[PDB]
Structure formats: structure tokens, C-alpha cells
Design a protein around this ligand. Sequence first.
Ligand code: HEM
Ligand SMILES: CCCCCCCCO[C@@H]1O[C@H](CO)[C@@H](O)[C@H](O)[C@H]1O
Ligand SMILES: CCCCCCCCO[C@@H]1O[C@H](CO)[C@@H](O)[C@H](O)[C@H]1O
Ligand SMILES: CCCCCCCCCCCCCCCC(=O)O
Ligand SMILES: CCCCCCCCCCCCCCCC(=O)O
Ligand SMILES: [Ca+2]
Ligand SMILES: [Cl-]
Ligand SMILES: [Cl-]
Length: 610
Amino acid sequence: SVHPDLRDVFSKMSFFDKIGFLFIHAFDKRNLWHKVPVPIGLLYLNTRRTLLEKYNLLAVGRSSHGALFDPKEFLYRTEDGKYNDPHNAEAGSQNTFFGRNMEPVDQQDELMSPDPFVVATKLLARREYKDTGKQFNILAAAWIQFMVHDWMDHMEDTGQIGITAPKEVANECPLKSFKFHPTKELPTNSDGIKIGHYNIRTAWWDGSAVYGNNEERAEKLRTYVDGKLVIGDDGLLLHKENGVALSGDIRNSWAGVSILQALFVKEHNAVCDAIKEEHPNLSDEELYRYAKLVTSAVIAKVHTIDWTVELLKTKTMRAAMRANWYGLLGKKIKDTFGHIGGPILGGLVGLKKPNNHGVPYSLTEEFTSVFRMHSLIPSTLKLRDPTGQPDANNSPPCLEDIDIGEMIGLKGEEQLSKIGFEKQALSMGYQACGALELWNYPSFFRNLIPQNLDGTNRSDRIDLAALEVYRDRERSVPRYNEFRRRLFLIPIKSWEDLTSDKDAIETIRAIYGDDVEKLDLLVGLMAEKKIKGFAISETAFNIFILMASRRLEADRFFTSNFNEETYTKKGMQWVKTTEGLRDVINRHYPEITAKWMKSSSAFSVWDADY
Ligand code: HEM
Ligand SMILES: CCCCCCCCO[C@@H]1O[C@H](CO)[C@@H](O)[C@H](O)[C@H]1O
Ligand SMILES: CCCCCCCCO[C@@H]1O[C@H](CO)[C@@H](O)[C@H](O)[C@H]1O
Ligand SMILES: CCCCCCCCCCCCCCCC(=O)O
Ligand SMILES: CCCCCCCCCCCCCCCC(=O)O
Ligand SMILES: [Ca+2]
Ligand SMILES: [Cl-]
Ligand SMILES: [Cl-]
């Protein structure tokens, strides 16, 4: 039968949705979807995706009456993300509402319940350091922040509020209190959801972390010759006199992200060289437009079939992510004959029309919440010598341990300037990142300098762990158990359902009591027992089934305009022949690649034996 908490929604479903639900629920009740052979696993995922697309896409703000335009007149990715969706010129652009995956839950009377500092101190603060083994390295951790920089940032109110640590835990808090800005609340003037928040980044997967979020930023980064972007002679980003990096989105960053931005600047410039060689007479503007299309597609491809495949290290997930990109008919057929069939057989990429499933494209409040993965950052970075004698392990030899707190923000840019690209990248490649588990949140995040929009330092330092828990509540995102119910997942009845870590359970009970409905989303996501091979929780993964597919399927430039006319022949060939981050690093840094990158993926610890 059907879980009691899901009986109501089940009874209201259409016959076809009832069938899909009973199929997935049969596996879920026995925790079986990830324990079956690949074909049944894929059917499960596709079925779950179809249900999420129907029940978990909610508009924020009025949907009708988008600004009028012809897509044939906009065959490029605009500086602010406008003019993608023919029916909604503003969809995916800078300064638009975050959508929702679920109806908001008002928590305005419980923003401090339980206390954010108590949560941060007792449940999140790093104790014994936990890492991912060989599965996922520090480049993988930098990569995902690099994507967040592409995707999402919430507009802030101009006023300030503050939180003070209670006496029970103050002695263990690096900060005793801190100030920050509330999330800006805007009226939707719509019949549905009444209050929304604005995304100040472009929600389209458009390489905006490299290119900028609007025309005013984008102009600052260009050489205006041959379509190219500015880069230093050391292969690192240039800096303004105030110490801020010249790149697309540089706010609240660190050295690991800066090297990826520099790498993709070189990628963009190399694409410019290649296209100009085939088409000698293109202007700077035309070359920039084509190269941005190519580089943003390379980024989406590397993320989809390389980064995600190492994050979710199972057979079913490698097949699923490759199917989203290439289709179930596979790369050879896709590359030779183009897109065949629908989203399953031919993939999301190269669909003849974009598909938003009836709801204007946006990234969502919940997508923000499940991407809060600050525990991926290790406490220290082991620097290695790119030209050292291979050690006892045949690794490059160790040079010194550096506190990763010294590699963050403006001071991090200074330290990176003394270390250089090769040493930073090699060192990050050879070290595991942190695991997404409880008690694994870096101490330097507990007394962090946050930045203004323009990248400059704020004087009010923050306890990020405490602030994150506060933000989810402030933004009306359902807490862990309700969040699961809204995704058609079986809720916990007791703490034992969540994890078998006895120490975790005892600490959770001391803070939340026996009220499973009180458990914060972030705490639940970190605590949840993980599927073998999964670096993330199943709960987070469910938001991603829907939203990662949506980033590709809703975008004209991954679908109707993913072709030679739009990208150029050479541009399309560049995307088609690039399979992962290894290919990009090999292009610009073949020496450290040949000497030290032994793993097939550049996201594995580089001496992994696969
Ligand atoms: C050392 C590196 C990092 C620093 C210094 C940093 C810092 C910050 C800061 C200061 C905020 C804003 C807090 C607020 O005002 O609400 C933030 C938000 C956020 N961060 Fe990080 N972070 C880092 C790494 C990462 C990583 C690895 C991820 C993984 C995806 C990540 C994901 C996010 C997300 C999803 C948000 C919320 C954005 C929003 O509210 O729209 N960050 N981070
Ligand atoms: C073991 C083989 C059982 C047959 C599986 C049918 C269950 C899936 O159900 C179907 O899923 C489709 C997407 O996968 C949806 O389009 C349909 O609405 C849903 O009914
Ligand atoms: C019964 C075994 C074969 C079932 C496989 C067919 C399921 C495909 O199902 C289709 O998937 C699409 C794309 O993902 C969904 O958008 C559609 O709603 C559904 O028609
Ligand atoms: C003998 C069992 C083997 C498993 C069978 C797998 C074949 C199913 C794949 C075809 C899916 C149908 C595609 C629908 C349209 C589309 O989205 O492309
Ligand atoms: C062949 C049909 C099955 C297709 C199922 C699609 C499953 C997509 C899973 C997406 C997981 C992405 C997790 C990484 C985070 C992200 O990119 O948003
Ligand atoms: Ca973007
Ligand atoms: Cl393939
Ligand atoms: Cl491709």
C-alpha cells in the first residue's frame, strides 16, 4: 500500500501519474532503486522525473505577457541572460524571482528555533576531519562553487539584523554575535505565492562566472580584439587596484575558484583563435559571441558527464547523466546522426525545441538550499611540487601545508599570486575534498569576512554555518521531513531512520528533542545515510533530478539552437570533442597532465587507479 503521508496526493493523481507513483514507491518502500541493474534504475529515474516536473515546479510572479521578440534576432547569449525564451524575454535573466519546487512554509515565528549558533556549534563544526577518499578532489569542490557563481545569489535588503550566541555555547563560538542583511522580500503581485526573492545572477547556464551577469560587468573583462578576455601573463586573473579579481562573478570566492576562472578564460581565448582561423573576417563581437556559446556549452558538458559522474559514482548514474547529454542511443550515434527520438533516446541536448513544462525557467529557492555544501572545503591544502622527484607513492613531493583560511577572499588572491597556477591546480588535484556529513564544517567559515556586490570586504564577519540555517528558515523553505514529503519521499518517523551514527542521534535529540518536524533541512541533508558511491544525500539528489535536467531542456542554446549555424562548425566540433575537465587542463597545461594526472577524470584524486 501507499505510505500514509502520501495517500492524499496519491488519491488526487491522474490515472497515469498514479501508475508512475506506484512504480517508484514500490522501490522506495524497500530502498531498492539504486540496487537494481541500470535499465530498471533509469526507468525509475525517468518516472520520478516526470512526476517532479508535474508537481514540483511553481511560478513566482506573474507568468503571462512576456516582452515581445523574435528568437531569430537573438542567436547568442546576452550579457544579462535576457531573450532566451521567446514567450518570456526576462526568464533566466539577472534580477528575476527565484521559483519554488514546493509551497513555502512560513517560519517567521521560529527563525531562531533551535538557536542557529547551537546548531552550528554542536552539529556542524568540524571535529575529526572526514574526506571522500579518492572519489572527489579539491578541484571538484572548487568546480561546484564556480557553478554556484554562474547560477545564483539572493538580493539583500539594505538594513541589517543580528544574531547573538546564547550563553550555553558562546564559549565555543569564534564569533559571539554577528550582523548581516535580511534577504530582500518583493511582492509578486500574483494570485499564487505572494512574496518572492530575486536572483542577482543569471539563472541560465551561460558561463556568467567568467563573462559577467550584465553588460556593465562584461565590458570590463574584454580586450575588444579577436573576441578575447583579459588574463595575466602568469595565466592567473588580473586584479584591480583594490585587490578584486577581474572575472565574471568574483564574490565570496577563494583561490580554487579563481584558477578555474583563469582556466576557462584561456579556454574562451583558444576557441576565439580556432574560430577566427576558420572564419578570418569575423569581428571582435561575433567571435566573442561564438566563443561564449562554445565555452558555456563546454562548462555544462564537463559538469554533466564528468563532474556529476564522479559525484554520484555508480553505474546507473553514469548511464543517466550520459543519457541527459548524448541520449540513450549514445555518443557515436549522437555525434554522427544528430538528435534522434525524444529526450530519452536523443538526450536533452539538441532537442528541436526547448521545454519548460509549462512554468517559466528559473532556479529555485530549494535548489539554493540543497546546494549548501560548504563542508566540501578541507581545513588545509597540501602544496606539491610540479617538477619534484616522484615520491614513495609516485606522487609529486609535498612542500608545505597551508591553512585554507589563508586562501580565501582578497587575501587568497594575494597568496595565489605567489603560488601560481600549476602548483595550485596540482595540489588541489592530489587532495581529497571534505565529505558532506555532520561535524565537518571548516572553522574558518565560523569567522568569515563576507563581501559586498563589488567584491570588497565587509566589516561584519559572519558565522556562515549559523547564517545558512537562518537563511533556509527566513526564505520559508520547508524543514527536512516536510521537504522529503513534498518530493514524494518517505519521511523519517524517528532519528534512527535518518542515520545509524549513535553520536549524531544523541546530539540531534539534545537539540531538537523528539520532534522530527523541527529538524533543519541542512542538518538532515548532512546527516542522511548515503547511497553507496553518492557524495550527496538522496533528498538533495531529488531536487537535482528535476533541476539539472531543466538547466539543459529549458535553454534554447542547448536545444533548438544547439547547432552549427549558431555555434559555427568549428565551435560545435570543439564542444563535441571535449569530454571532461582533463581535456581542458590538458589543452592549456599538458606537462602537469602528462606527468601527474593518472586518473581518467581530473575530478578524482589524481592518483586514483581508474
Ligand atoms: C571557501 C569557499 C567559500 C566561501 C568563502 C563561501 C562563502 C559564502 C558566503 C559568504 C555566502 C553568503 C551567505 C549569506 O549572506 O547568505 C555563501 C552562500 C552560498 N554558498 Fe558559499 N562559500 C564557499 C564555498 C562554497 C561551495 C564549495 C559551495 C557548494 C556548492 C557553496 C555554495 C553556496 C550556496 C548554494 C550559497 C547560497 C547562495 C544564495 O543564498 O543565493 N559555497 N557562500
Ligand atoms: C518493470 C516494468 C514496469 C513498467 C513501468 C511503467 C511505470 C512507469 O510509469 C510511467 O512512467 C512514464 C515515464 O517513465 C510516465 O510518462 C508515465 O506517466 C508513467 O505512467
Ligand atoms: C515500459 C518500458 C518502456 C517505457 C519507457 C518510456 C517512458 C518514456 O516516458 C516519456 O518520458 C519523457 C521524457 O523523459 C517524458 O516527458 C514523457 O512524459 C513520457 O512520455
Ligand atoms: C529487453 C529489455 C531491455 C530494456 C529496453 C530499453 C529500451 C527502452 C528505450 C526506449 C525509450 C522510449 C523513448 C521514448 C521517446 C524519447 O524520449 O526518446
Ligand atoms: C534515461 C532516462 C533517465 C534520466 C534521468 C535523469 C537524472 C538526472 C540526475 C541529475 C543529478 C545531478 C546532480 C548534480 C547536481 C546538479 O547538476 O544539479
Ligand atoms: Ca548564469
Ligand atoms: Cl554515450
Ligand atoms: Cl557534445
